Design a protein around this ligand. Structure first.
Ligand SMILES: [Cu+2]
Ligand SMILES: [Cu+2]
Length: 224
């Protein structure tokens, strides 16, 4: 009550207001087209996050490099009776030390989640607060009303997105998350699905044209 309303100002001024501003600005430039506005603004955000994404894909690919060391340390503890919290903690400590020495962050895998969630919520809030969108229609769907086709499209492109990024826990992201996206998409305004679809397509095209190269082992072992 005293400071929970103080966070309202932070959430509005720093997240919702700018997000809501981007949508309305582009839409008014394109003659009230909020459909094309959502598309362009989404691409704009994905463009600003492009260098950030590259740094993350580099970290993921760096983890693949030290996999022989991850395999070896696992073997050392595999033959021993594990599963117990005492032996499990020992493995975690030895595993973490491998990441530290080679300058690799295992938190890189769930890092995009920390960045997407605020943007997703900001987009959703900006859409709902903007009253002049619920009557706008794009293609075959209403921007303020749920759709029965778009959520399925969003689930396929989400699947394909993860499909390309995963080079030669894994099962959850590509087989559980896409169906969970579709379910959520059906119970949410079509604006989010469209927003999600474009987001996926951007990532798919990016991964196709821009491939991150794996850092040499020499680079990792020479970490400060
Ligand atoms: Cu208020
Ligand atoms: Cu204020």
């Amino acid at each position: 009550d005293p400071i929970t309303s103080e966070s309202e100002g932070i959430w509005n001024h720093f997240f919702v207001y700018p997000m809501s501003w981007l949508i309305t600005t582009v839409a008014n430039l394109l003659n009230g087209s909020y459909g094309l506005s959502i598309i362009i603004v989404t691409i704009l955000i994905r463009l600003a996050l492009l260098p950030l994404t590259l740094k993350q894909q580099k970290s993921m690919r760096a983890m693949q490099v030290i996999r022989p060391e991850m395999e070896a340390i696992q073997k050392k503890y595999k033959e021993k009776a594990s599963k117990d919290p005492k032996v499990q903690q020992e493995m975690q400590k030895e595993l973490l030390g491998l990441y530290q020495k080679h300058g690799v962050n295992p938190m890189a895998g769930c890092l995009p989640l920390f960045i997407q969630l605020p943007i997703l919520m900001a987009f959703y809030f900006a859409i709902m607060r903007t009253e002049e969108i619920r009557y706008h229609t794009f293609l075959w769907f209403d921007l303020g009303q749920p759709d029965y086709i778009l959520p399925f499209v969003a689930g396929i492109t989400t699947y394909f997105q993860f499909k390309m990024t995963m080079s030669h826990q894994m099962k959850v992201m590509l087989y559980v998350m896409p169906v969970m996206i579709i379910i959520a998409g059906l119970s949410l305004p079509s604006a989010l699905s469209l927003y999600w679809v474009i987001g996926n397509i951007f990532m798919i095209i990016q991964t196709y044209f821009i491939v991150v190269k794996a850092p040499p082992l020499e680079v990792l072992e020479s970490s400060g």
